[PDB]
Design a binder for this molecule. Structure first.
Ligand SMILES: *[C@@H]1O[C@H](CO)[C@@H](O[C@@H]2O[C@H](CO)[C@@H](O)[C@H](O)[C@H]2NC(C)=O)[C@H](O)[C@H]1NC(C)=O
Ligand SMILES: *[C@@H]1O[C@H](CO)[C@@H](O[C@@H]2O[C@H](CO)[C@@H](O)[C@H](O)[C@H]2NC(C)=O)[C@H](O)[C@H]1NC(C)=O
Ligand SMILES: *[C@@H]1O[C@H](CO)[C@@H](O[C@@H]2O[C@H](CO)[C@@H](O)[C@H](O)[C@H]2NC(C)=O)[C@H](O)[C@H]1NC(C)=O
Ligand SMILES: *[C@@H]1O[C@H](CO)[C@@H](O[C@@H]2O[C@H](CO)[C@@H](O)[C@H](O)[C@H]2NC(C)=O)[C@H](O)[C@H]1NC(C)=O
Ligand SMILES: *[C@@H]1O[C@H](CO)[C@@H](O[C@@H]2O[C@H](CO)[C@@H](O)[C@H](O)[C@H]2NC(C)=O)[C@H](O)[C@H]1NC(C)=O
Ligand SMILES: *[C@@H]1O[C@H](CO)[C@@H](O[C@@H]2O[C@H](CO)[C@@H](O)[C@H](O)[C@H]2NC(C)=O)[C@H](O)[C@H]1NC(C)=O
Ligand SMILES: *[C@@H]1O[C@H](CO)[C@@H](O)[C@H](O)[C@H]1NC(C)=O
Ligand SMILES: *[C@@H]1O[C@H](CO)[C@@H](O)[C@H](O)[C@H]1NC(C)=O
Ligand SMILES: *[C@@H]1O[C@H](CO)[C@@H](O)[C@H](O)[C@H]1NC(C)=O
Ligand SMILES: *[C@@H]1O[C@H](CO)[C@@H](O)[C@H](O)[C@H]1NC(C)=O
Ligand SMILES: *[C@@H]1O[C@H](CO)[C@@H](O)[C@H](O)[C@H]1NC(C)=O
Ligand SMILES: *[C@@H]1O[C@H](CO)[C@@H](O)[C@H](O)[C@H]1NC(C)=O
Lengths: 172, 409, 150, 50
C-alpha cells in the first residue's frame, strides 16, 4: 500500500485488505470458508439414512471421503465401480446397497470389451431378434391463462386504478 | 461431366455441448453475513428458491447434454495392439498411452486452445475429461474395427479396407475403385489428417465457437459481480457501511433499495442463462444426432456431416464441446463426355441398369455416375423397355451379347 | 405463483383487503403500490419461465412430428433416430400431454468368425461381389449377405 | 425405373409446367399464403409499438 492508501477493494467494492491503524501492516480479508450443503439420499420409502456433501471444501475445515466435488460424509468409499445412480460430480456417484448403507464410487462407463480385429476375419450374423423399444416424448403442456387484475388486485377498484398507471404490462 | 479422379478430404466441425454449471446463493449475494437484510429478503417469499431451482435445472441439463452426446455406447471398446488397418494411419486420433490422461494428440491440441466469495460457485461436471476421452476412444475403436455394426447391436469385426468398400458403395462408387486405388486413398487420408493437425496447431480461431461460450458465461458472471458495486439509489453500495452508520428505521429503506436492485440483477442473470442453456441444448441435440448418424452409421444427408459424399466420421473431445472429423469423398477431375439417355439396337430401347452412357467421340460405353470407368455396353449392363420411337435423344449403336460367341462354338 | 400472494413485499400485510379496511387513501396507496410491484414481478417471472419451457416443448413436439413422418409413415435410414437397431416400422401411441412411439427394429443376435477376402483371382481376373462379401468356412469360399449368414 | 420418365417425358414436363402455373395463380390470389412471415413482421412491429 502507498502511504496514503488505507483500504483495498475487490470488484464488488467489498473490502479486500485493510491497513491496521496502530501498526502499519496490511492484512488481507478473505471471508471465512463456506459452501453449499447437499444431501445424498435414497427415497424415504426405502431408508432414512443420508450422506452429506460439503461442496468444494476439504474435510479438515469442517466415514469421510474427500472428492473434488467436496467432502462426502456418511458414505463408505467402495473400490468397485457400478452404473451411476445418484450423481455427485467429478466422476463420483452414490447408491444404496448392501445390512445396507450408502456407498460412493467412481462410476463405471460400461463393460470393458475388445474386438477380435484382424485383417482377414469378419463376423457375420447367423440369427436375428426383433426388438421393440418405447420412446416417450412431450408434445404439449397445460394451457394456463392468468388474469392480472384478479391476481394482483381482485375485487378492488383502488388497486386496479393504481395498476392502470403501469400501462400495458398486463396485456403483454 | 463425369469425374475421372477423386480426393479424400477431412473437415473439422466444432459444436458446443455443455456450459459451466454455475450456482448462485441469493442470501450471500444479496445480503451476505447480515441478518437484517436476510429478514427483509424473507418478505419477498420464493423469489430466491425459484432462482436456485432454475440454476439447478441448468446444471443438471449440462450433464444430460454430455451424456446424450458421448454416452451412446454400452461398452468400452479398444483397438488391437497391431494397427493393421490397410495403410490408414490413426495414430493422431487414437489415445496416446504415454500421457497422464489418455487423450489423443489432436485432443491435446484442442485442450490447449480453449482457456466465489459473493455466493457464486462452479460445480464440477459429472463426466471428467478422462471419462469423455474414454468414451471417444470407445466410439473410435468401434468405428474402426466394426464399422456401423456396433451402433445397431454387437460389434462385428471387419477388415478396415472392406468397411471402406461398403462406405464407397453407399455413395454410388463400386467397391473395386477403392481396392484398385487403396494405397492412394490411404495416403490422401493420412495427408488430410496431417493438415488437420497443422491447422489446429497454427489457427487459434478454429475453436472460436467454444471460446465464445466460455467468454459469454464468464462475462455474465463478471457483470453480476460488477452489479454489487451499484447503489440503486442508496447512500452506499456496501451493505455493512449502511448498517454500521444508520439505525434501523431508515436503514431498512436503504437496504430495501439494494435488495430490489440486486434481486433484479440475479433475475436478469438467470433469465439469460436459461435462454443460453436452451441454445446449448439445441447444439448438444445436434451433436448427438451427428454422433448417431455419422460416426455410428453413414449419412445420406447432404452437408449434414461435412461437405462431400460422407464416408465416415471420428469424434474428438474438446473443452465444453465435441469435435467431429468428417471424412468425405470429393470428385477431383472431370472430362466432357457426350451422352445419350438410351440406345436403339434392333428397334429395342436399351437403358443402363446402373450408370450412364458416354461417348469418347467414336465408341459408346457405360460408366458409373460418380467415377469414370468405361465398360463395353452389353445386355448385362442394360435393360430393354419399349422401343426407339418414344425416347427423346435416343442414338444408334450396337449392344454386344456375351452369349452369342458362347453359342457359336 | 399462488404462494407469492402470501408475501408482504415490504407492506404491512399481504392481504389487500386488510390494508384497505384499516388505512385511508394517502398512505394506503403506497402500501398497495408495494404489493403491485411485487405481484407484477411474480407474474413476469412466471410468464418468462413459461415461454422458455414452451420453447422446450415446441422443440420436443417438432422432434415428435419429425419422427412420426419419417418412422411411422416411412422407414428411417437414420441410425438411432427411431430406436436402436435397423429400423423396420414404428407404431404411435397417445399419452397424456405426449406421444409414445413403439419402434420395431432388426437386431443381429448370433455371429460366427469367418475368414474373408476382398476379391478372388480366377483366370487372372479379379472377381468382386455384386452384393455381400466373400467368406470361408475353412475349406470352401462362399458369397453371403452382409447382415445375415446365407 | 428411369425408363418411365423417358417414355412419359412430355407428360411429366407438362404436369410440372402446369403445377408451377398453379403456384403462380395461388400466390397471385391467396394473401394468407405468406402468413407465417407476416406474423413475424407483425410480432416485432407491435412489440416496438408497445
Ligand atoms: C434363432 O433364434 C431363435 C430365438 O431367438 C431360435 O428360436 C428358438 O429355437 C429353440 C430351439 O432350440 C426353441 O426351443 C425356442 O422356443 C425358439 N424360440 C422362438 C422365439 O421361436 C431359432 O431356432 C434360432 N435359429 C438359429 C438358426 O439359430
Ligand atoms: C489422381 O489424383 C492423385 C492426387 O490426388 C494422383 O496421385 C499423384 O500422382 C502423381 C503422378 O503424376 C504423383 O507424383 C503424386 O505424388 C500423386 N499423389 C498422391 C497423393 O499419391 C493420381 O495419380 C491421380 N490419378 C489419375 C488417374 O489422374
Ligand atoms: C503414423 O503417423 C505418425 C505421424 O507422426 C508416425 O509417427 C512418426 O513415425 C516416424 C517414423 O515411423 C517418426 O520418425 C516420427 O517421429 C513419428 N512421429 C510421431 C509424432 O510419433 C507413425 O509412425 C505412423 N504410423 C505408421 C504405421 O506408419
Ligand atoms: C474410344 O475408346 C475406344 C476403346 O478404347 C478406342 O478404340 C481403341 O483405340 C485404340 C487406339 O487408341 C486401338 O488400338 C484399339 O484397337 C481400339 N479398340 C476398338 C474396340 O476400336 C477409341 O480409339 C477411342 N476413341 C477416342 C477418340 O478416344
Ligand atoms: C437410327 O437407325 C434407324 C434404322 O437403323 C434409322 O431409321 C432410318 O431412317 C431413315 C431416314 O429417316 C429411313 O429412310 C429408314 O427407313 C429408317 N429405317 C428404319 C428401320 O427405321 C434412324 O434414322 C437412325 N437415326 C439416326 C439419328 O441416324
Ligand atoms: C464348408 O462348406 C462346404 C459346403 O457345404 C462343405 O462341403 C460339404 O461337406 C459335406 C460334409 O459335411 C459333404 O457331404 C459335401 O459333399 C461337401 N460339399 C462339397 C461341395 O465339398 C465343407 O465340408 C465345409 N467345411 C467346413 C470346415 O465346414
Ligand atoms: C416406494 O414406496 C412405495 C410405497 O411404500 C412402494 O410400493 C415402492 O415399491 C417403493 N419403491 C421401491 C423401489 O422400493
Ligand atoms: C485442504 O484442501 C486441500 C485441497 O487440495 C487438501 O490438499 C488439503 O490437504 C486440505 N487440508 C488442509 C489444508 O489441512
Ligand atoms: C482400494 O484400492 C486402494 C488402492 O490404493 C487400496 O489401497 C485399498 O486398500 C483398497 N480397498 C479395499 C477395501 O480393498
Ligand atoms: C467442357 O466444354 C466447355 C466448352 O467451352 C468448356 O468451357 C469446359 O471447361 C469443358 N469442361 C472441362 C471439364 O474441361
Ligand atoms: C439437342 O440440341 C440440338 C440443338 O441443335 C438439337 O438439334 C437436338 O435435337 C437436341 N437433342 C435433344 C435430345 O433434345
Ligand atoms: C472370434 O475369435 C476370437 C479369437 O480369440 C474370439 O475371442 C471371439 O470370441 C470369436 N468370435 C466369436 C463370435 O466367437
Amino acid at each position: 500500500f502507498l502511504p496514503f492508501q488505507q483500504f483495498g477493494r475487490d470488484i464488488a467494492d467489498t473490502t479486500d485488505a485493510v491497513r491496521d491503524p496502530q501498526t502499519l501492516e496490511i492484512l488481507d480479508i478473505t471471508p471465512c470458508s463456506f459452501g453449499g450443503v447437499s444431501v445424498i439420499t435414497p427415497g424415504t420409502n426405502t431408508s432414512n439414512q443420508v450422506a452429506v456433501l460439503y461442496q468444494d471444501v476439504n474435510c479438515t475445515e469442517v466415514n469421510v471421503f474427500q472428492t473434488r466435488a467436496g467432502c462426502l460424509i456418511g458414505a463408505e468409499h467402495v473400490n468397485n465401480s457400478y452404473e451411476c445412480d445418484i450423481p455427485i460430480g467429478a466422476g463420483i456417484c452414490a447408491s444404496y446397497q448392501t445390512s445396507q448403507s450408502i456407498i460412493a464410487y467412481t462410476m463405471s462407463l460400461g463393460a470393458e470389451n475388445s474386438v477380435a480385429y484382424s485383417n482377414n476375419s469378419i463376423a457375420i450374423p447367423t440369427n436375428f431378434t426383433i426388438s421393440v423399444t418405447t420412446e416417450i416424448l412431450p408434445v404439449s403442456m397445460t394451457k394456463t391463462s392468468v388474469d392480472c387484475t384478479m391476481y394482483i388486485c381482485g375485487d378492488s377498484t383502488e388497486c386496479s386504478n393504481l395498476l392502470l398507471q403501469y400501462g400495458s404490462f398486463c396485456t403483454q | 461431366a463425369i469425374p475421372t479422379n477423386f480426393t479424400i478430404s477431412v473437415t473439422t466441425e466444432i459444436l458446443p455441448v455443455s456450459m459451466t454449471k454455475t450456482s448462485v446463493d441469493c442470501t450471500m449475494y444479496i445480503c451476505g453475513d447480515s441478518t437484517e437484510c436476510s429478514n427483509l429478503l424473507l418478505q419477498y417469499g420464493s423469489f430466491c428458491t425459484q432462482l436456485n431451482r432454475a440454476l439447478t435445472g441448468i446444471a443438471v441439463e449440462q450433464d444430460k447434454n454430455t451424456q446424450e452426446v458421448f454416452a451412446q455406447v454400452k461398452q468400452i471398446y479398444k483397438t488391437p495392439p497391431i494397427k493393421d488397418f490397410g495403410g490408414f494411419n490413426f495414430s493422431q486420433i487414437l489415445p496416446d498411452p504415454s500421457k497422464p490422461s489418455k487423450r489423443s494428440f489432436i485432443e491435446d491440441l484442442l485442450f490447449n486452445k480453449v482457456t466465489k466469495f459473493n455466493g457464486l460457485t462452479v460445480l464440477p461436471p459429472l463426466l471428467t475429461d478422462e471419462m469423455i476421452a474414454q468414451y471417444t476412444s470407445a466410439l473410435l475403436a468401434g468405428t474402426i474395427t466394426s464399422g456401423w455394426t456396433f451402433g445397431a447391436g454387437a460389434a462385428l469385426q471387419i477388415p478396415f479396407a472392406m468397411q471402406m468398400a461398403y462406405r464407397f458403395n453407399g455413395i454410388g462408387v463400386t467397391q473395386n475403385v477403392l481396392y484398385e486405388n487403396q494405397k492412394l486413398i490411404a495416403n490422401q487420408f493420412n495427408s488430410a489428417i496431417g493438415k488437420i493437425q497443422d491447422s489446429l496447431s497454427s489457427t487459434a480461431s478454429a475453436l472460436g465457437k467454444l471460446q465464445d461460450v466460455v467468454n459469454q458465461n464468464a462475462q455474465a458472471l463478471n457483470t453480476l459481480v460488477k452489479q454489487l458495486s451499484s447503489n440503486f439509489g442508496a447512500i452506499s453500495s456496501v451493505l455493512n457501511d449502511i448498517l454500521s452508520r444508520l439505525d434501523k428505521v431508515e436503514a431498512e429503506v436503504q437496504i430495501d433499495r439494494l435488495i430490489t436492485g440486486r434481486l433484479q440483477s440475479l433475475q436478469t442473470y438467470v433469465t439469460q442463462q436459461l435462454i443460453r442453456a436452451a441454445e446449448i441444448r439445441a447444439s448438444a441435440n445436434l451433436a448427438a444426432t451427428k454422433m448417431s448418424e455419422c460416426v455410428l452409421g453413414q449419412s445420406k444427408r447432404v452437408d449434414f456431416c461435412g461437405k462431400g459424399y460422407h464416408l465416415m466420421s471420428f469424434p474428438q473431445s474438446a473443452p465444453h464441446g465435441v469435435v467431429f472429423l468428417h471424412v468425405t469423398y470429393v470428385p477431383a477431375q472431370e472430362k466432357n463426355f457426350t451422352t445419350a439417355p438410351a440406345i436403339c439396337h434392333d428397334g429395342k430401347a436399351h437403358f443402363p441398369r446402373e450408370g450412364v452412357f458416354v461417348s469418347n467421340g467414336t465408341h459408346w460405353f457405360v460408366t458409373q455416375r460418380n467415377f469414370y470407368e468405361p465398360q463395353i455396353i452389353t445386355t448385362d449392363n442394360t435393360f430393354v423397355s419399349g422401343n426407339c420411337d418414344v425416347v427423346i435423344g435416343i442414338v444408334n449403336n450396337t449392344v454386344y451379347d456375351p452369349l452369342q460367341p458362347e453359342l457359336d462354338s
